[PDB]
Amino acid sequence: EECMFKDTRLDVLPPQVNPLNAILAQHTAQTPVHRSLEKRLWTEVRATAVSE
Amino acid sequence: LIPVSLVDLININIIFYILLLYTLLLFFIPLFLASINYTYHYIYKYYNYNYNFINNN
Predict the structure, then answer these.
(1) How far apart are the CA of A30 and the nearest CA of chain B, in angstroms?
(2) Which residues contact residue A15 at a Cβ distance below 8 angstroms, ignoring those fewer than 6 apart?
(3) For labelling, which of A20, B8, B23, B38 has a CA lying 20 to 30 Å from the CA of A50?
(4) Contact status, residue A12 vs residue B48, Cβ threshold 8 Å
(5) How many Cβ atoms from other residues are within 10 Å of residue B54's Cβ?
(6) Which range marks the domain in which residue B2 is found?
(7) Nearest CA distance, B26 vs chain A (angstrom)
(8) Tally of structural domains, chain B
(9) Which of A6, A8, A9, A24 to mutate against chain B (most B CBs within 10 Å)?
């Protein structure tokens, strides 16, 4: 009843959770493993492309 | 007794009383509504959007 005469903003703060972790997790859960290794190949070939 | 009377049932004097009373009430409504609540002060003070940033690393 006396909520107006208090300051509980410290008792209730916004969480520091990154939703990107849940997004990449759902992405890995949807993708297979051979595509992950393919993406490692895409990155390696992109590195050689930037090199040349 | 005096108030036991059919004349006092539709008394025009009391009807004028009611008329003037509620005309003045209608005139002064916008001053009766002029009380302040402190709820939007609370909402401004306590509403805190998520200020954390995204960091993939």
Answers:
(1) 20
(2) B50, B52
(3) A20
(4) no
(5) 7
(6) 1-57
(7) 34
(8) 1
(9) A9
Cβ–Cβ gap B38/A4 under 8 Å:
yes
Q: DSSP per residue over A7-43, as a string?
A: --TTTS------HHHHHHHHHHHHS-HHHHHHHHHHH
The CA distance from A14 to the nearest CA of chain B, in Å, is 6
This entry's atomic model was obtained through cryo-EM
Q: Which two tokens stand for residue A41?
A: 């190949």
Measured CA to CA, the distance from residue A3 to residue A11 in angstroms comes to: 13
Q: DSSP state, B4? A: S
A14/B49 CB distance under 8 A: yes
- The resolution of the experimental structure, rounded to one decimal in Å, is 4.3
- What are the distances in angstroms from CA A52 to CA A26, A41, A47? 35, 16, 9
